[PDB]
């Protein structure tokens, strides 16, 4: 078998293949995650260079791992499918043996462990993908939002963004998000998520996708018209 | 040892691109243009054979359009030999699904499976990727008529109208201009041929330089028919649309 | 058909004292109605103040002892010459025995020594590794003859105090090393009389804080 | 385990399964639910050798739930039954086969029809209006042959099911400790708590 | 062997006998048929001594690894299923095990799972397992209520093992009592049947058949 | 698992004051057929060890090749191969015992009973038994097969315990072995008159005697035995 | 230069640079001395510390009751090789009831190290070993190099500044060989030998490490206040 | 290119030496051993204020009597921790006892050099393994990707290591109490850290014979930080 060590250290103590995988994430479309008091919202950018697309059948950016957890990403689309499939298999395996669905932290730890494994295994390159994993633990009403990256490190975030121009939207979230009082309602949380994407997106038409996840496996994806109403209200308040 | 001669086909560039995928896409950009157009009552697949000869036996020839099952077909852009490897794998996958569930495979599931195979060659194994881009035209009872494309990266996307191979930039602009949502198959046939006729590097578009196919519900009652056009049938539709 | 098991007879006996422990065993080795040897040592010093005997099928018995002695050696190498405690040895032996759960060592194993508080310890095993710390245990062919006698004369079972008539039990006073050796010798003499696979000689290993001592006694050779 | 019954009526499928679990000479439990929900509109009951039954049922459950998440779509009862049959057909030529017989009751939301499939441990699948595994059918099929009509309501199906259980309680030697009854229709799966 | 466990108001009572036999030969009267998996989990042993004791000792290692990895104690459901899935892999090889996995957690409350070597895994309120299980069932079923005091529940468990120790030839020796609560299990002593029988006979007025 | 085909009968042996004696007849039986009359079943290893083998002859020849190969291997990169680092009886035995127990554990035994007789470096007598089951034991006298039942009783009258070994000379020990071989010829239906005998002494070394015969047999009394009870003629 | 990328490449003058670079790792290691008489064999090792808070790296490893070694270079490689020796000593005991000859132990180490110098992918061992032992032919001392070369000697030293101790032993050859039935005097000679390799630092109580094996003396290691006697 | 297991002309493994450079870039971790216990402390170093700092897990339990702190590419530590936990629990299963801290460390270090062309590269993380056993008492070990481990009375690893180690050189003595050690870790962490030290960006832990391994609450650490400020202002 092909056993070549692709991910290796350099004289300055860097693993360039892992670092170049982050550059692939930097190229990917922007993804954002914001958790409120009783919800988490996942915002995703759709680049409008591709029109004549069939939005019914085109792979959506946000993927359900289980009925209570979701996963969005930035980076290589093909790579993301492999992580999502493994995550979905592990979710069912956990239910089968532990007789309880995965916690959001556990699922994140698994996905992060897969990513790490691909940074010191022979004959493989790292995943060019960073993920945002969000949801609610079984029988728990505390919102959960985690991030992973090609190196395999993961951590919890009150709010976070990844992908292209993520530096800008992170700048926005850092000044606008208050920890002592997070978005109390679904409306406030979605509004803040759409606002953060409007700093980068371009047009607020079909370029913004929003997915709201609530406790007890209550997940729903907002439509174009529903999102367009948020876009309208934000700019009308801005004209002042 | 052997390390000396390894090209390392599955690595990132400093910019975060996959060298071999990018170079495979460059190869595909010189291949004959293939176009897919999805309508409300069917799907059209049109493709240009590359600089043919008068001594090529056309009626028994097949380099662009292939049948995966009774409901799904593909248009090829790139290395034909690479494509046939993947086509035979896709045909088997469709039959495995049919044996397991006793139902025809949904289009997206077939597309995802092939796209995953392509992805694998970019991440592990140390082999070169498949220098192939597919346009998938298919039907199932969930989403109805569907158009997809996949490329050597293993990434796939859904489309209303799409082109692969040569002059896709020019072709996509023309499709984006004249395409409408309430369009029908007969109109889509005309759009496909007109787009090829303008983007072609050849002097004139003729029957012997084309492969053509449709997937219609235009079959007796609730069912789907695949029609791979014969040379004479391509010649007739060229006269009908007013190109020759 | 090939039968991979055999029966080499013999009998063993472990008794735990207050600050000592003994492991005894006869020196006769047999197959069917023949004597192989009148003196074939069966109880072994395994190091770290632990004595061991694996009675039954001698080939499996030797194999197990050999592997445990090996385990003690590697325990020293891997853990900075640390002394293997009797409880740790017992758990290790369980895994050696259960490792061959589906092709068992056909033996009854007994180890003896001192626990980490310096008190006398005897552990007893079945062929597939189930074990238990005991104050008293006989093993092997004549185990059914010896154990009841030890229940009576070591644990004072079914004994009460005169005058009270079944009301007050006989108190469980501790036994000295001289008192235990008497019970061991009488156990084996009695077993030799009524069991054909027991005889020739008795070898006793006594374990104290000072180390491992040996005593040998003649048994009837018929 | 012992008795599992199935009946497909006009607009639903009804599965009845005994509550007893017996090992040797003791009834260890009298409230055991011998079924698993594979999907919102598909239920599978099971009976066979101890351990194998639950292990197989939960394995199938996990696979269908995995499919549901991956495609965001519920498989048809026919598709699920074919998947289950293939697993059992694969199993019968294994080193140690799954010794499990199953009934699959589902409501096809596409065709708006209830469907009942009987599959044994060999991988023998049949679609039926009513079915049973083990010695149950030796009693219940004669009753069902007489009374069953294809346009029965759910309430009529339950009454006909009570007549089956009454016959079993009269003539079968084993005390199976009654049955848990579940109904599968367009609205999903629900349990009849009083039977 | 006679082992039982039952749920009640004050948690769980676990009671076991102490006898081990090889045919008609009494191999031991001092066997520990309850295994302390952790301060909140107990396992009972019936059938093959080595099988039960090896794999329940092994189960404790798996449970300890779970709480190290997950920073949270393992559920009784998950602990029982680790054992049942393990023995299921060995099915047909000839393992002989009849066990109860007994514990308490916040999410579950007091829980008992019957796990055996055929792969059977059952949640329940009352279980008796072993050669003398039928004898224990007689006393338990006629006297069981949810509203039992810790003191009365303990005696019922003790008395049920005694009943089986008397009638079942392969049960006896002594009775080990455990009481599992919200704050963990609590050992309640070794009770020799040789003394317990006469004590119960005199005080309770039972066993009038026997002469004393 | 198999069955023995061509077989060798008893191997007998004992210790004496300065060494050990071992003997075995020269027969290779094929069931009740006394097929091969020139089979050597005592195989010397160096000048300090003799391995006597009974049971399956095909497995004996395999073991013979292993020992031959063992000597070759020991000589490799060994300047003291004919001195301090020569093969000892204890080394040879332990090797065989390992192989025998390994083979029985794979359910494919070498169908033999083996006695390794020799003298160690320090002059100590070595005599130990091993068989197809991997069972091992040592004793002042050792014998396989019928020898165990008939030879041991006779040899144990000479050396009954360890303290009798220094009191037993080589002449007395050899006499007892030769008598035992005669008794086996009287009573073992799968024995032959012809046998080999080997003495390993700490002083005089290895003495290997071939083509020995059972002699001084008592048969004359047979003429007086008539009928099976009542018959007079 | 161009021929040092891997172990599978000879240079134009017939040299194996990766093996030579592995040899260099030994020279960087702390000094250790080995010497023997007819009755006993002694190892003396100067242990090295990272800093004042750190412990002094152990240099001596026991392989059997009658054999052991001292290391200089990559310690993990010494652990791998010593583990192999333990197994080989143990195989000899279990199968043949025979204590492994020190000469044969050297042959086994040579062959194990050699395979790593001829195959692609692997690397040479980066450690040198001094093996002492007492077997059926008396006391022995071996020097192991990861090139594969093993040499039996009366005395030697390896590591940094080892040339000083090696010269001393070359002068003292006739004296220390005669130290029979006197372990303390043989150790004294070893401690005096390793002292010739010292600069700036001197032998302290937690710095020095000594081991001995002999006629009626199992392989035992002395550290801490047990070696204060010899300082 | 060149082999992964290649020696440099100086006699060092290139990849091992390069992994040590990655560890220097890592966040600071400090360990101090006393007769009353061993203290382990780390710098969390959150990359952004939106990152919930309590999810940063750089101090980890291996067993009840053994704890562990990390520095460098912390993702690489997960398989090392898993192995350590398994080794600890497995030894308890085989021997019915706690495993020695040194033996546990040795088991972890056996993984280190299992790389070639096994894993494709060395670990890019250093570990401070602290614990207690009956034989050698309270112990602190520094496990490197070279496969080498040193025992230490006190040790600092990460970006501010040489500065912290020099400070530990002067401050450590054999009669230190547990409380004195806790404050000393906090003092040195505060010195080498970029951002100002508080309970949210720094974490403490200890291992004692009685209570075993414990990660300190943010409320408990906050008091020790306040106690530190006052005693420094006292002179
Ligand atoms: B109990 O009777 O099931 C008992 C429990 C076990 C934990 C000691 N088992 C045994 O006594 C078994 C035999 C048996 C008797 C009756 C039913 C089932 C099994 N005996 C042993 O496991 C055993 C162990 N060591 C020595 C002898 N016998
Ligand atoms: Mg007799
Ligand atoms: Mg059927
Ligand atoms: Mg398991």
Overview of the structural elements:
The structure is cut from a larger assembly and holds 8 protein chains of 8 kinds. Chain A has 6 helices and 10 strands. By secondary structure, chain A is α+β, with helices and mostly antiparallel strands. Chain A has a single domain (1-240), classed as Glutamine Phosphoribosylpyrophosphate, subunit 1, domain 1 (4-Layer Sandwich). In chain A, the strands form 2 sheets. A 5-stranded antiparallel β-sheet of chain A has the order 8-1-2-9-10, covered by helices on one side. A 5-stranded antiparallel β-sheet of chain A has the order 3-4-5-6-7. The longest helix of chain A is centred in the middle third of the chain and has 22 residues, at 77-98. Chain A is globular. Chain E has a single domain (1-212), classed as Aminohydrolase, N-terminal nucleophile (Ntn) domain (Glutamine Phosphoribosylpyrophosphate, subunit 1, domain 1), CATH 3.60.20.10. Helices cover 36% and strands 33% of the residues of chain E. In chain E, the strands form 3 sheets. In chain E, strands 5, 6, 7, 8, 9 and 10 form a 6-stranded antiparallel β-sheet that branches. A 5-stranded antiparallel β-sheet of chain E has the order 11-1-2-12-13. The two termini of chain E are 26 Å apart. Chain F has helices at 57-75, 89-105, 146-156, 170-187, and strands at residues 6-8, 11-16, 19-25, 28-30, 33-36, 42-44, 49-56, 112-119, 125-131, 136-138, 141-143, 194-201, 205-213. Chain F has one domain: Glutamine Phosphoribosylpyrophosphate, subunit 1, domain 1. In chain F, helix 3 runs antiparallel to helix 4. Chain F is an alpha+beta fold and 233 residues long. Chain F starts with 5 loop residues before the first strand and ends in a 20-residue tail after the last strand. Chain H has 6 helices and 10 strands, in the order H-E-E-E-E-H-H-E-E-E-E-H-H-E-E-H. In chain H, the strands form 2 sheets. Chain H has a 5-stranded antiparallel β-sheet with strand order 8-1-2-9-10. In chain H, strands 3-4-5-6-7 form a 5-stranded antiparallel β-sheet. Helices cover 36% and strands 24% of the residues of chain H. Chain H is an alpha+beta fold. The A-B interface holds A 2, 4, 6, 16-17, 20-27, 50-59, 76-79, 81-82, 123-128 and B 3, 6, 8, 10-17, 38, 107-108, 112, 115-116, 118-119, 122-127, 143, 146-148, 153-162, 172, 175-176, 179. One magnesium ion (MG) binds at residues 82, 85-86 of chain E. One magnesium ion (MG) binds at residues 118, 120, 124, 126 of chain D. Chain E: This is Proteasome subunit beta type-5. Chain E: Belongs to the peptidase T1B family. Chain E: The active site is at residue 1.
Which class do the helix and strand fractions of chain C yield? alpha+beta
The CATH architecture of chain C can be named as 4-Layer Sandwich
Strand elements of chain G, count: 10
Number of strands of chain C: 12
Taking the alpha carbons of the first and last residues of chain C, their distance comes to 33 Å
> Which fold does the CATH topology of chain G refer to?
Glutamine Phosphoribosylpyrophosphate, subunit 1, domain 1
The largest sheet of chain C, given as strand count, sense and whether it forms a barrel, is: 5 strands, antiparallel
- Strand line-up across the major sheet of chain C: 10-1-2-11-12
Q: Secondary-structure element sequence of chain C?
A: EEEEEEHHEEEEHHEE
The fold-level CATH name of chain C is Glutamine Phosphoribosylpyrophosphate, subunit 1, domain 1
Count of alpha and pi helical runs of chain G: 5
The succession of helices and strands of chain G, N to C, reads HEEEEHHEEEEHHEE
Number of helices of chain C: 4
- Multimeric organization: part of a larger assembly
The gyration radius over C-alpha positions of chain G equals 18 Å
Can you tell me the number of structural domains of chain G? 1
Q: Please report the first level of CATH classification, the CATH class of chain G.
A: Alpha Beta
What is the general shape of chain G? globular
CATH superfamily of chain G: Aminohydrolase, N-terminal nucleophile (Ntn) domain
Family (chain G): Belongs to the peptidase T1A family.
Cross-link (Glycyl lysine isopeptide (Lys-Gly) (interchain with G-Cter in ubiquitin)) (chain G): 188
Organism (chain G): Saccharomyces cerevisiae (strain ATCC 204508 / S288c)
InterPro entries (chain G): Ntn_hydrolases_N (IPR029055), Proteasome_alpha (IPR050115), Proteasome_alpha-type (IPR023332), Proteasome_asu_N (IPR000426), Proteasome_sua/b (IPR001353)
């Amino acid at each position: 078998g092909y056993d070549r060590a692709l991910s290796i250290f350099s004289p300055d103590g860097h693993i360039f293949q892992v670092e170049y995988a982050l550059e692939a994430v930097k190229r990917g479309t922007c993804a954002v995650g914001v958790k409120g008091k009783n919800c988490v919202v996942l915002g995703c950018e759709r680049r409008s260079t591709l029109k004549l697309q069939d939005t019914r059948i085109t792979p959506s950016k946000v993927s359900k791992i289980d009925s209570h957890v979701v996963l969005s990403f930035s980076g290589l689309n093909a790579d993301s499918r492999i992580l999502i499939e493994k995550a979905r298999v592990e979710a069912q395996s956990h239910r089968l043996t532990l007789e309880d669905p995965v916690t959001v932290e556990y699922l994140t730890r698994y996905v992060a462990g897969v990513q790490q494994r691909y940074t010191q295994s022979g004959g493989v390159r790292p995943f060019g993908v960073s993920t945002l994993i969000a949801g609610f633990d079984p029988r728990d009403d505390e919102p959960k939002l985690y991030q992973t990256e090609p190196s395999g490190i993961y951590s919890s975030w009150s709010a976070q963004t990844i992908g292209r121009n993520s530096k800008t939207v992170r700048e926005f979230l850092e000044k606008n998000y208050d920890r002592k009082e997070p978005p109390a309602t679904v409306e406030e949380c979605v509004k803040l998520t759409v606002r953060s994407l409007l700093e980068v997106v371009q047009t607020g038409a079909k370029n913004i996708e929003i997915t709201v996840v609530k406790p007890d496996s209550d997940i729903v994806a907002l439509s174009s018209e529903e999102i367009n109403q948020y876009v309208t209200q934000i700019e009308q308040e801005k004209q002042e | 040892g052997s390390r000396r001669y390894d090209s390392r086909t599955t690595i990132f560039s400093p910019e975060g691109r996959l060298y071999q995928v990018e170079y495979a896409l460059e190869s595909i950009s010189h291949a004959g243009t293939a176009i897919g157009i999805m309508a409300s009552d069917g799907i059209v697949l049109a493709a240009e054979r590359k600089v043919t000869s008068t001594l090529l036996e056309q009626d028994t020839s097949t380099e662009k359009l292939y049948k995966l099952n009774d409901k799904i077909a593909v248009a090829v852009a790139g290395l034909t030999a690479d494509a046939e490897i993947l086509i035979n794998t896709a045909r088997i996958h469709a039959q495995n699904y049919l044996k397991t569930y006793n139902e025809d495979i949904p289009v997206e599931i077939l597309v995802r499976r092939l796209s995953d195979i392509k992805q694998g060659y970019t991440q592990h194994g140390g082999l070169r990727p498949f220098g192939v881009s597919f346009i998938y035209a298919g039907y199932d009872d969930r989403y109805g008529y569907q158009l997809y494309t996949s490329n050597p990266s293993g990434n796939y996307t859904g489309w209303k109208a799409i082109s692969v191979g040569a002059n896709t930039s020019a072709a996509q602009t023309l499709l984006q201009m004249d395409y409408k949502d309430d369009m029908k198959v007969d109109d889509a046939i005309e759009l496909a041929l007109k787009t090829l006729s303008k983007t072609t590097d050849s002097s004139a578009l003729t029957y012997d330089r084309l492969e053509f196919a449709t997937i219609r519900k235009g079959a007796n009652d609730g069912e789907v028919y695949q029609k791979i056009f014969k040379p004479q049938e391509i010649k007739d539709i060229l006269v009908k649309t007013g190109i020759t | 058909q090939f039968n991979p098991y055999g029966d080499n007879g013999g009998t063993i006996l472990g008794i735990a004292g207050e600050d000592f422990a003994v492991l005894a065993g006869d020196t006769r080795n047999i197959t069917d109605y023949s004597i192989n040897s009148r003196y074939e040592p069966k109880v072994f010093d395994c190091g770290d103040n632990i004595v061991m005997s694996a009675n039954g099928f001698a080939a499996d018995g030797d194999a197990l002892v050999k592997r445990f002695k090996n385990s003690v050696k590697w325990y020293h190498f891997d853990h900075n010459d640390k002394k293997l405690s009797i409880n740790s040895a017992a758990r290790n032996i369980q895994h050696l025995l259960y490792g061959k759960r589906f092709f068992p060592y056909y033996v009854h194993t007994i180890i003896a020594g001192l626990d980490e508080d310096g008190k006398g310890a005897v552990y007893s095993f079945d062929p597939v590794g189930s074990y238990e710390r005991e104050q008293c245990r006989a093993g092997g062919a004549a185990a059914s003859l010896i154990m009841p006698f030890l229940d009576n004369q070591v644990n004072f079972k079914n004994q009460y105090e005169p005058g009270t008539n079944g009301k007050v039990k006989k108190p469980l006073k501790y036994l000295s090393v001289e008192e235990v050796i008497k019970l061991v010798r009488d156990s084996f003499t009695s077993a030799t009389e009524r069991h054909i696979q027991v005889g020739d000689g008795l070898e006793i290993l006594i374990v104290t804080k000072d180390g491992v001592r040996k005593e040998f006694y003649e048994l009837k050779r018929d | 385990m012992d008795i599992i019954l199935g009946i497909r009526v006009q607009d639903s499928v009804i599965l009845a399964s005994s509550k007893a679990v017996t090992r040797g000479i003791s009834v260890l439990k009298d409230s055991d639910d011998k079924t698993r929900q594979l999907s919102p509109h598909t239920l599978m009951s099971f009976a066979g050798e101890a351990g194998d039954t639950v292990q197989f049922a939960e394995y199938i459950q996990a696979n269908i739930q995995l499919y549901s998440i991956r495609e965001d779509y519920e498989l048809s009862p026919q598709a699920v039954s074919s998947f289950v049959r293939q697993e059992l057909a694969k199993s019968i030529r294994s080193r140690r086969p799954y010794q499990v017989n199953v009934l699959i009751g589902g409501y096809d939301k596409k065709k708006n029809k209830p469907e009942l499939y009987q599959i044994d441990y060999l991988g023998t699948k049949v679609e039926l209006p009513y079915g049973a595994h083990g010695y149950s059918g030796f009693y219940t099929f004669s009753l069902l042959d007489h009374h069953y009509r294809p346009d029965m309501t759910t309430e009529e199906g339950l009454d006909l099911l009570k007549l089956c259980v009454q016959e079993l309680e009269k003539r079968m030697p084993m005390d199976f400790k009654g049955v848990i009854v579940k109904i599968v229709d367009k609205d999903g799966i629900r349990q009849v708590d009083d039977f | 062997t006679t082992t039982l466990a039952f749920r009640f108001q004050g948690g769980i009572i676990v009671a076991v006998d102490s006898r081990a036999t090889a045919g008609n030969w009494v191999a031991s009267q001092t066997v520990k048929k309850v295994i302390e998996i952790n301060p909140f989990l107990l396992g009972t042993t019936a059938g093959g001594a080595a099988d039960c004791q090896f794999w329940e000792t092994w189960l404790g290692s798996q449970c300890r690894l779970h709480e190290l990895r997950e920073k949270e104690r393992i559920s009784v459901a998950a602990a029982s299923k680790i054992l049942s899935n393990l023995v299921y892999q060995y099915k047909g090889a000839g393992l002989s095990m009849g066990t109860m996995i007994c514990g308490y957690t916040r999410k579950e409350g007091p829980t008992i799972y019957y796990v055996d070597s055929d792969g059977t895994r059952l949640k329940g309120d009352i279980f008796c397992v072993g050669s003398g299980q039928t004898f224990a069932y007689g006393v338990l079923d006629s006297n069981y209520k949810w509203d039992l005091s810790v003191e009365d529940a303990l005696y019922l468990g003790k008395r049920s093992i005694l009943a089986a120790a008397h009638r079942d030839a392969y049960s006896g020796g002594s009775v080990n009592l455990y009481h599992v609560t919200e704050d963990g299990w609590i050992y309640h002593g070794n009770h020799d049947v040789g003394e317990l029988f006469w004590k119960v006979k005199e005080e309770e007025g039972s066993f009038n058949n026997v002469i004393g | 698992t198999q069955q023995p085909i061509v077989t060798g009968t008893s191997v007998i042996s004992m210790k004496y004051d300065n060494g050990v004696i071992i003997a075995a007849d020269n027969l290779g039986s094929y069931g009740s057929l006394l097929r091969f009359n020139g089979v050597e079943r005592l195989i010397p290893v160096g000048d300090n060890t003799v391995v006597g083998i009974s049971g399956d002859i095909s497995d004996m020849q395999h073991i013979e090749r292993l020992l031959k190969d063992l000597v070759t291997e020991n000589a490799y990169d060994n300047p003291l191969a004919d001195a301090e680092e020569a093969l000892e009886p204890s080394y040879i035995f332990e090797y065989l015992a390992t192989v025998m127990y390994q083979r029985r554990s794979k359910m494919n035994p070498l169908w033999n009973a083996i006695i390794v007789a020799g003298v160690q470096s320090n002059g100590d007598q070595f005599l130990r038994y091993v068989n197809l089951l991997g069972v091992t034991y040592s004793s002042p006298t050792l014998a396989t097969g019928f020898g165990a039942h008939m030879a041991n009783p006779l040899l144990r009258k000479v050396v009954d315990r360890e303290s009798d070994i220094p009191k037993t000379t080589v002449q007395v020990a050899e006499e007892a072995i030769v008598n035992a071989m005669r008794v086996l010829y009287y009573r073992d239906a799968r024995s032959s008159r012809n046998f080999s005998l080997a003495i390993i002494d700490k002083n005089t070394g290895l003495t290997f005697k071939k083509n020995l015969q059972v002699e001084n047999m008592k048969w004359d009394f047979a003429k007086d035995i008539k009928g099976y009870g009542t018959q007079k003629i | 230069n161009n021929y040092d990328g891997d172990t599978v490449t000879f240079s134009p003058t017939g040299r194996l640079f990766q093996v030579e670079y592995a040899l260099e790792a030994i020279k960087q290691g702390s000094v250790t001395v080995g010497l023997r008489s007819n009755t006993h064999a002694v190892l003396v090792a100067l242990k090295r510390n990272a800093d004042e808070l750190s412990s002094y790296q152990k240099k001596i490893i026991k392989c059997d009751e009658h054999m052991g070694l001292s290391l200089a270079g990559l310690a993990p490689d010494a652990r791998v090789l010593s583990n192999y020796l333990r197994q080989q000593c143990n195989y000899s005991s279990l199968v043949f009831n025979r204590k492994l000859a020190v000469e044969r132990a050297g042959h086994l180490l040579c062959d194990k190290a050699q395979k790593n110098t001829q195959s692609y992918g692997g690397r040479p061992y980066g450690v040198g070993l001094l093996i002492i032992g007492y077997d059926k032919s008396g006391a022995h001392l071996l020097e192991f190099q990861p090139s594969g070369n093993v040499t039996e000697l009366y005395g030697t030293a390896i590591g940094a500044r080892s040339q000083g101790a090696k010269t001393y032993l070359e002068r003292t050859l006739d004296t220390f060989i005669k130290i029979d039935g006197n372990p303390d005097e043989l150790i004294k000679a070893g401690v005096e030998a390793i002292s010739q390799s010292l600069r700036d630092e001197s032998l302290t109580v937690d710095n020095l490490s000594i081991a001995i094996v002999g006629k009626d003396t199992p392989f035992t290691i002395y550290d801490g206040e047990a070696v204060a006697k010899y300082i | 290119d060149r082999g992964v297991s290649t020696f440099s002309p100086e006699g060092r493994l290139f990849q091992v030496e390069y992994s040590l450079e990655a560890i220097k870039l890592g966040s600071t971790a400090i360990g101090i051993a006393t007769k009353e216990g061993v203290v382990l402390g780390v710098e969390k170093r959150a990359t952004s204020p939106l990152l919930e700092s309590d999810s940063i897990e750089k101090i980890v339990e291996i067993d009840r009597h053994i704890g562990c702190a990390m520095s460098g590419l912390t993702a690489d530590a997960r398989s090392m921790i898993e192995h350590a936990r398994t080794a600890a629990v497995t030894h308890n299963l085989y021997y019915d006892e706690d495993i020695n801290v040194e033996s546990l460390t040795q088991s972890v270090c056996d993984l280190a050099l299992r790389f070639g062309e096994l894993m494709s590269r060395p670990f890019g993380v250093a570990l401070l393994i602290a614990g207690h056993d009956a034989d050698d008492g309270y112990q602190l070990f520094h496990a490197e990707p070279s496969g080498t481990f040193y025992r230490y009375n006190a040790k600092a690893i990460g970006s501010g290591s040489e500065g912290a180690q020099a400070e530990l050189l002067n401050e450590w003595h054999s009669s230190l109490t547990l409380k004195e050690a806790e404050l000393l870790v906090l003092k040195i962490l505060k010195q080498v850290m970029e951002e100002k030290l508080d309970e949210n960006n720094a974490q403490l832990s200890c291992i004692t014979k009685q209570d075993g391994f414990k990660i300190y609450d943010n409320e408990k650490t906050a008091e020790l930080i306040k106690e530190l400020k006052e005693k420094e202002a006292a002179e």
